[PDB]
């Protein structure tokens, strides 16, 4: 129910987070097959085959029968080690992006949480507006009944009333909308959520921008991923270099053989050579090769890896400019939130005193209760529009921390301190 | 001209629909080559080759003249069947997404069709606004001429007139833009389109939400595609399992070769063995093999397929909760459309009576005709903003029908029933 | 500083432009390896291997020792030439898109610049608004001090003041934002930028739209790229046709051999055949093959390439509809800009005369100076909202020129003519 608990149940409800985790699992597991080729290749084959050599040596008839194990083991080829390193760095990549997605979950969660509150706010306010305009219409109606005014005004207040009805329904509708938005990252409905403890609000001042810039230089996930991409490009480079490598290898195998000769040609002077055999063999030995020159195969690849490299570096710098922009913008947004909160506070005070004034106006009955509710309307609107400003302060409070690439459950707990009273959702 | 006919010509004018159709054609045709490998592989590779030995067995010249056909046919390998099933499911995928795109074309079609209707409205009424403000400029002008109100007001009205002119030009401009928007899907410019039969609106109540839930769950295209994706992942799993398959084979080949001999070394005791060859051959037989352990080849792939599976499943549930969200939101939007239509109707009646009232004001001339056209302004603005609301009702109709995964020409035919009088576009 | 210089320093600062450049370098360089296969394949693969017979073959140990260079050279396979042509066309593609981004850098570069100007504008004027409202607060305050009015008004003016303060901070904030936006393209902060020379502002009429269309047919980069895609699809088609090609080839290689015998079975009646032999060889000759029939390999591929072709064609027409839409829309936007500029000009004149009027009002003291500054507020707001309109005129100019697929530094120079006075940024 509390934002913390909301994070808790939602910690498993997210598929994409779990999806990404599983993807990381795919990467780390893929490292295994990345290690695989270096290991020896035990194998087996078998065959049977009749043959008939027509023409010249025509009339011979020869079935053939054989089977063999074939162990093989390459030794010298660093390219596989290279690919292994690629797999490693890619794994680190997947790790980082996974953490990123975690932070994303945090953000979305908090956002969706606040939206419900805001919807409740607008709901109630639009309601009070409804009643106010309603008795406005009733008054005006009665005023026509005694004939003081033109019918046109009656229809006017009519239109006001219908309009505000639409305003009710759309808002109430937005309520459940946001509710389902919450279920989207939960899979569960919630009857109620804790109200903000506005009385104990934190008007915390921002840290100086430069240190934040430093921490940003140190620990944004994205730029880190860029650097990993760069190093990976370097790995691609040496992998392109790998083509020049001599390929030391070692075969090892044994094989049975049968083959029973037949046909009239075998008859007469078989000379043992035409006789059926039972031979078997245990071949084992080195294998090796070297490309020397291959039409410029391993040449263009080099430059390709190079362009890939420098381009990746460009992406890195782009990320750099990006994080600078983002963090500054966030900081600034926080300040904006501050000032806005100030303004709306004062507005609250204003509408309040105005309200009390008009209430006194009804105290000796100078006005109508309707008007009192008009001031009441302005009052509430100002109220949780100010609350809205506070939540915006919170969101910015996360974004800057998000900008750092840091974030944790603990910040959300600090948020959880802010919550207070239970509040029914619908 | 009518929305139905517009859809009719639209059915061929769309490239992307036809594109997707042809893509389905590709997906189906590819199933054929998916069936292909099982078929026998006939072949030929005759060639000639000189040879000149040296060192130890130096000086014995020769030249082979090989020529042989090679039919081949493996029998046991389920992995290919697996890939066939994959291709099948892929074809189902392409099918589903194709139908989806059809619905998409429908939606966009009706949308663009309505936008024109709206722009016409805004155009006309804006024009009336132009005339009204104009004659205000004239009145105020003359009022300066007789020496009354200060020049500043004159320039004010001037600004009004110029501003509203700009509004005209941008209005007309948007009109032709929308016309082109229509041509974009149609490839045709249309001088005129049918007006809505506003007199006979359909105030249908929405069905209870749960039934719609059950239906859409039963037949949404997207989630269906997800399920196909999951099944495909399972197929990938058995395909990973396929690496344990022994590979039964059957070679079948034949042909002749003539290696003529030459060189001085052949001279002396040729022993028939050094005579020129003239042999042919008819080899045929099985070629079995089983991989045994191979460094963990067919291992990591298993878990990879597994993670692929579960992640796909997570996507499935994701899309599930998603469509729940969407359909509820749609229902809600429809209700909003209802209430809005109500409100604007009443606003229409109101502004109308206000109009008639002021007209009566001019009946003894208390006002100016411009004022009457101000009431007229608010009037028609209200009118076809209400029309706009009705179109929104239509769009929501198609949307709720869309989330079902249903949709067809028929609802659009009912929309065609909604249409009435011809109206020139520009 | 001037827009031209800004473009100049920026012209190298862009990563993505340089990125695309290097990518073009890749596309070109890859043509080399595309040419590569036709070249001769020199090679080598020496190796050594022990052998030990058993069962009938038992007791005759040996160890083969082989070494051989291996040149190879294919003669006839058009598919390689085909793929070469593919690579060529791909190079053309990367070229074109590179040109696209070359325009893209320009557009944004103007955009942010004008945004900076605008931000400066709104900033200053908001400041003036601040001072005005401030003195209203002071007036109302003092008025309460002598007690002419209710406290509620005091709080009202209070609220106005805090609000406008918030507007200041967000304004300044937006200023620095835009500054950083500029740095994003440049990597450099800028103290100052040239003011527009509004006095000599251009108002050229657009060329008639049809001529612009014929011009459009010439060289939009996008559509050209589409046509290249089509031709590429055709190349894919002939490449599918290339599976019918007989594969004429030429083997050419030489190698030595040693192979030493061992074992007691070799002893006795060796018959020369059971003796060590240091043979060498110089094999050379033709190679050839032809598929005949392969289970429908090169069949489904044909239809596949065909579908690829037609789909590409559909994309081409899609691009056609696209460019028509965009160019007309641009033209229209220009017209809108014109009329808007007209309107705001007149508004400026109006507010000006109103200002002078009220100034005269203070000349004999009929009003507060604050009010005069209110007119001042409306004044400047109108002023550089009009400026904003002029920049929109410029942006539209660049847009329509962009739709042409044209654009150059020279148009930006023509823009550079428009600039005038130096202006500090913050």
From Swiss-Prot, chains A, B, C:
Positions with biased composition (Polar residues): 250-265
Activity control summary: In vitro, inhibited by hexaamminecobalt(3+).
Sequence repeats: 1-208, 209-424
One Gene Ontology term from the biological process aspect of the record: monoatomic ion transmembrane transport
Result of changing residue 374 to A: Decreases inhibition by hexaamminecobalt(3+)
InterPro entries, per the entry: Bacterial_OMF (IPR051906), OMP_efflux (IPR003423), T1SS_OMP_TolC (IPR010130)
Periplasmic side: 1-40, 75-246, 290-426
Residue ranges, annotated region (Disordered): 248-276
Phenotypic effect of disruption: Cannot grow on efflux substrates novobiocin or fusidic acid.
Keywords, ordered alphabetically: Antibiotic resistance, Cell outer membrane, Membrane, Repeat, Signal, Transmembrane, Transmembrane beta strand, Transport
Membrane disposition: Multi-pass membrane protein
GO CC field: cell outer membrane; efflux pump complex; MacAB-TolC complex; membrane; outer membrane-bounded periplasmic space; periplasmic side of plasma membrane
Cellular localisation: Cell outer membrane
GO molecular function, one term: identical protein binding
Ranges annotated as spanning the membrane: 41-52, 61-74, 247-257, 279-289
Extracellular side: 53-60, 258-278
Pfam families linked to this entry: OEP (PF02321)
Domain note: Forms a continuous, solvent-accessible conduit: a 'channel-tunnel' over 140 Angstroms long that spans both the outer membrane and periplasmic space. The periplasmic or proximal end of the tunnel is sealed by sets of coiled helices.
Family as reported in the entry's similarity comment: Belongs to the outer membrane factor (OMF) (TC 1.B.17) family.
Annotated NCBIfam families: PRK09465.1, type_I_sec_TolC
Role description: Outer membrane channel, which is required for the function of several efflux systems such as AcrAB-TolC, AcrEF-TolC, EmrAB-TolC and MacAB-TolC. These systems are involved in export of antibiotics and other toxic compounds from the cell. TolC is also involved in import of colicin E1 into the cells.
Summary of subunit composition and partner proteins: Homotrimer. Part of tripartite efflux systems, which are composed of an inner membrane transporter, a periplasmic membrane fusion protein, and an outer membrane component, TolC. The complexes form a large protein conduit and can translocate molecules across both the inner and outer membranes. TolC interacts with the membrane fusion proteins AcrA, EmrA and MacA.
Protein name: Outer membrane protein TolC
Lineage per the UniProt record: Bacteria, Pseudomonadati, Pseudomonadota, Gammaproteobacteria, Enterobacterales
């Amino acid at each position: 129910e509390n934002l913390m608990q909301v994070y808790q149940q939602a910690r498993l409800s997210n598929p994409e987070l779990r999806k990404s985790a599983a993807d990381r699992d795919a990467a780390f597991e893929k490292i295994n097959e990345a290690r695989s080729p270096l290991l020896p290749q035990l194998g087996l084959g078998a065959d049977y085959t009749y043959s008939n050599g027509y023409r010249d040596a025509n009339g011979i008839n020869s079935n053939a029968t054989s089977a063999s194990l074939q162990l093989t083991q390459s030794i010298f080829d660093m390219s596989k080690w290279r690919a292994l390193t690629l797999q490693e760095k890619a794994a680190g990549i997947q790790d980082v992006t996974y953490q990123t997605d975690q932070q994303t979950l945090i953000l979305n969660t908090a956002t969706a949480y606040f939206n419900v509150l805001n919807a409740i706010d607008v709901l109630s306010y639009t309601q009070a507006q409804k009643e106010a305009i309603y008795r406005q219409l009733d008054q005006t109606t009665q005023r026509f009944n005694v004939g003081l005014v033109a019918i046109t005004d009656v229809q006017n207040a009519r239109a006001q009333y219908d309009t505000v009805l639409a305003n009710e329904l759309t808002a109430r509708n937005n309520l459940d909308n946001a509710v389902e938005q919450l279920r989207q990252i939960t899979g569960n409905y919630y009857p109620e959520l804790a109200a903000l403890n506005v009385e104990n609000f934190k008007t915390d001042k921002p840290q100086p921008v430069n240190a934040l810039l430093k921490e940003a230089e140190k620990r944004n996930l994205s730029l880190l991923q860029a650097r990993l991409s760069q190093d990976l490009a370097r790995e691609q480079i040496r992998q392109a270099q790998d083509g020049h490598l001599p390929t030391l290898d070692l075969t090892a195998s044994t094989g049975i053989s049968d083959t029973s000769y037949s046909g009239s040609k075998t008859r007469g002077a078989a000379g043992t050579q035409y006789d059926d055999s039972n031979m078997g063999q245990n071949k084992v030995g080195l294998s090796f090769s070297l490309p020397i020159y291959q039409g410029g195969m391993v040449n263009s690849q080099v430059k390709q890896a190079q362009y890939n490299f420098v381009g990746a570096s460009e992406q890195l710098e782009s990320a750099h400019r990006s994080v600078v922009q983002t963090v500054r913008s966030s900081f600034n947004n926080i300040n904006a939130s501050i000032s806005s909160i100030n303004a709306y506070k004062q507005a609250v005070v204003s509408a309040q005193s105005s309200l009390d004034a008009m209430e006194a106006g009804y105290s000796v009955g100078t006005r109508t209760i309707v008007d009192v509710l008009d001031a009441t309307t302005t009052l509430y609107n100002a109220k949780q529009e100010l609350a809205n400003a506070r939540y915006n302060y919170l969101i910015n409070q996360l974004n800057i921390k998000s900008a750092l690439g840091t974030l944790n459950e603990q910040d959300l707990l600090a948020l959880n301190n802010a919550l207070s009273k239970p509040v029914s959702t619908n």
